[PDB]
C-alpha cells in the first residue's frame, strides 16, 4: 500500500503521503497528491483500492462543501470524522464496499486545538497523536512512540516525520517516490513544497 502518515503536534496536524502511483510493473506517476481538502480547516488523506480511493474522497468532499453552503458554517473536525466513519460503516456491508483507509487532520477553531483521526475501510475510527495506514505504522510507530511530545512545534513535527520517512526509505521494499506534506492549523491548510530535502 501507499504511505499515509499523520502527526498531531501542539498547534497543528501534519499529514505526509507518498507520491507514487504504481500499476503493476510500472510507476505511472511520482507526483500524486493523495489528499482532499474537506473544508478550510480539515484535510483528509487516503489509500486503498485503485478507483475507490479518489471516488470516495471526492464524494466526501462534495458532502462537506454542501453542508458548509447550506449552513454557512464549518463542521468541527470531530463532526466531519463521524460523518465519514458512518459512510464507511455503511459501505462495509454493501454490495461492493469502498476499500479506502483515511486519516483526517483538522484544526478545531472553536476548541483551538488540532485533531487527528484514523479510520479504516471498516469504519473503525480512533483519535491519536499520530497514526498511519497499511504497513507504514510498522516501521514508524517505534520512532514516534519514542520522540513524540504533546508540546512539539510544527518544526519539531516536520523533523520527526523526516526521520520516519528516512526509516521508511531504508527498510521498506517499495519506492514510494517521497511524500507530499501538508500542515493544517488555525490559519488553514498549506503545503510544505520543500521536503524533497528539508
Amino acid at each position: 500500500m501507499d504511505i499515509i502518515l499523520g502527526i498531531r503536534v501542539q498547534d497543528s496536524v501534519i499529514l505526509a503521503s507518498s507520491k507514487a502511483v504504481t500499476r503493476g510493473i510500472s510507476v505511472l506517476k511520482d507526483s500524486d497528491d493523495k489528499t482532499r481538502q474537506l473544508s478550510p480547516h480539515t484535510l483528509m488523506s487516503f489509500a486503498g483500492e485503485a478507483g475507490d480511493t479518489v471516488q470516495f474522497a471526492e464524494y466526501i468532499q462534495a458532502n462537506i462543501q454542501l453542508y458548509s453552503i447550506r449552513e454557512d458554517y464549518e463542521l468541527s473536525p470531530q463532526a466531519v470524522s463521524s460523518f465519514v466513519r458512518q459512510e464507511l460503516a455503511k459501505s462495509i456491508r454493501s454490495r461492493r464496499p469502498y476499500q479506502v483507509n483515511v486519516l483526517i487532520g483538522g484544526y478545531d477553531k472553536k476548541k483551538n486545538k488540532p485533531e487527528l483521526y484514523q479510520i479504516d475501510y471498516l469504519g473503525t475510527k480512533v483519535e491519536l497523536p499520530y497514526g498511519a495506514h497499511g504497513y507504514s505504522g510498522f516501521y514508524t510507530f517505534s520512532l514516534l512512540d519514542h520522540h513524540y511530545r504533546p508540546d512539539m512545534t510544527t518544526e519539531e513535527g516536520l523533523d520527526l516525520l523526516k526521520l520516519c520517512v528516512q526509516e521508511l526509505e531504508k527498510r521498506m521494499p517499495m519506492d514510494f517516490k517521497g511524500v507530499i506534506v501538508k500542515i493544517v492549523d488555525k490559519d488553514g491548510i498549506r503545503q510544505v513544497d520543500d521536503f524533497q530535502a528539508q
Binding site: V21, R23, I25, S26, L28, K29, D32, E49, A50, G51, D52, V54, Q55, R96
Partner: protein, 212 residues
Amino acid sequence: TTTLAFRFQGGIIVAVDSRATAGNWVASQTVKKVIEINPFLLGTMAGGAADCQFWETWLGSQCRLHELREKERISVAAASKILSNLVYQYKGAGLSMGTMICGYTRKEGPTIYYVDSDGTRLKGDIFCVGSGQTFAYGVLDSNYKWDLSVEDALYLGKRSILAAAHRDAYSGGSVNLYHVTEDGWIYHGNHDVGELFWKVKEEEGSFNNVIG
C-alpha cells in the same frame, strides 16, 4: 499492445501499434487503437477492443451532447471524467481497458488523462499503456524534452512504439501517429513496422544486434 501519449511545447503526441492477438494467434496487424472522439479529442485503446471501442465512441456522443447543451467546447478534464465515472459504475463486472484521453483546450492547454477500468483517472505528461509499455517508456524517458519540435516529437513517439513492436510479441504491425493542437488533431500516417524497422536501423545505426 503498445500505446503512448506525451505532452510538450507543440501539444500532444499520440502513437500506437496495430496488432491484435488472441493467445499466440495474430488476429490482425491492421487494427485501430486510437479513437477519434471528435475533431479535438483522441482516445487510445489498450486491453479489451470491444470495451474501449464501445465506451470511447459513446464518450464521443456524450461530449457532443455537452457542447449542444452548453454552447461551449468540453474540457479534457470533463470528458475524461465522464468515461471514468461510467467505467467506475461497472467496477467488478469485468470491463478491461487502459486508456489515454487527449485534448488541447484554450482553458487547459495540452492535456492527457489516463483512465482504466479499475476506475483510475490520472492527469500526466507522459503515459504508456500495454504489454509493450516498458519498452516505450525506456525510449521516451531518455529522449523526452518539453522543448522538442513537432517534427522530433512525432519521431520520438514513432520510435518508441518501434522499440516495443520489436521486443514485445504482442505488439507490432504498424505505427499510427497523431499530433494534437488546440485547433484539433492531425493524423500523421500509418507506418508499417516491417519497413520502418529496416529503415530506422540503417539511418539510425541502432538495432545493431539484428542482422540486416
